[PDB]
């Protein structure tokens, strides 16, 4: 299948070179997989989700995304026009308030929740969790991410946007999960992207068009935008049967475009998520 005039990031993950505009992908499109977006929530009524999105848990007064961020990330995972895995099932877990902030205890509860909840869902091709959030180092937050991963969920987390070593941030610094840095459309590391030995992979994160609240769209930037590209790619590869939740990050790194990025500090992987699609 081919989506013409696709957002640049989708095109990038299906090409060996920058500058293309078509997103090439297998028609299966992540059908049978499930992705939990742990964020400010998801506007499940957005037409772009085609009824494939559902809020399953909130830690606040409402399950509504009054922010937009969560809806944006979810859209990159699996909306019709802006998503990597266009037929996946999306589950929203609201651990961040409408200002986009949240306490570590809530974020941890949200991760433990997903580890259990997945047992009540029909996700024959596998389960993924996308965490476009983080703060200063916390061994407790790292441990929660490690538990989620151990439970059989492919965990993808943002590296962070402080243009610093991700070793000082969580859950980015948990080695067992898939830590995602950001790149721009010219194959440069995004100016704000964290870096470091703990990064596993890069994905498109600068100027990413996706869904927004009020049934709209908008372009924003961040490692928060790169993460759902990788989470969606994982869902897509699991549906194809190429990898499992335990090994998806490694598989993605192994099949990545290698050495194409610029401004990568020594010691940081030069790997860009790639779907290896061949018609």
């Amino acid at each position: 299948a081919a989506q013409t005039n696709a957002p640049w990031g989708l095109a990038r993950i299906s090409s060996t070179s920058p500058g293309t505009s078509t997103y090439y992908y297998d028609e299966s499109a992540g059908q049978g997989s499930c992705v939990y977006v742990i964020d400010t929530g998801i506007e499940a009524s957005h037409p772009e989700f085609e009824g494939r999105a559902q809020m399953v848990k909130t830690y606040y007064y409402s399950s509504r995304d009054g922010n937009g961020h969560g809806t944006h990330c979810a859209g990159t995972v699996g909306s019709r026009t802006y998503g990597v895995a266009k037929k996946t099932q999306l589950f929203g877990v609201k651990v961040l308030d409408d200002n986009g902030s949240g306490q570590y205890s809530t974020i941890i509860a949200g991760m433990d929740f997903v580890a259990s909840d997945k047992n009540n869902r029909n996700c024959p091709k596998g389960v993924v969790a996308s965490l476009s959030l983080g703060g200063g180092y916390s061994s407790s937050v790292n441990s929660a991410a490690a538990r989620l991963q151990s439970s059989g969920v492919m965990v993808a987390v943002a590296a962070g946007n402080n243009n610093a070593d991700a070793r000082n941030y969580s859950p980015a610094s948990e080695p067992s999960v898939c830590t995602v840095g950001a790149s721009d459309r010219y194959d440069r590391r995004s100016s704000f992207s964290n870096y470091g030995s703990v990064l596993d992979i890069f994905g498109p994160g600068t100027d990413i068009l996706s869904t927004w609240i009020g049934g709209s769209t908008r372009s924003i930037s961040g490692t928060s935008m790169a993460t759902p590209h990788v989470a969606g790619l994982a869902a897509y590869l699991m549906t194809l049967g190429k990898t499992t939740a335990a090994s998806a990050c490694r598989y993605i790194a192994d099949t990545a475009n290698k050495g194409d990025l610029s401004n990568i500090p020594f010691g940081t992987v030069n790997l860009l998520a790639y779907n290896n699609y061949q018609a």
Binding site: G100, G102, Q103, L133, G134, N161, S224
Partner: peptide, 4 residues
């Protein structure tokens, strides 16, 4: 603890 964001706005990330």
């Amino acid at each position: 603890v964001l706005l990330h």
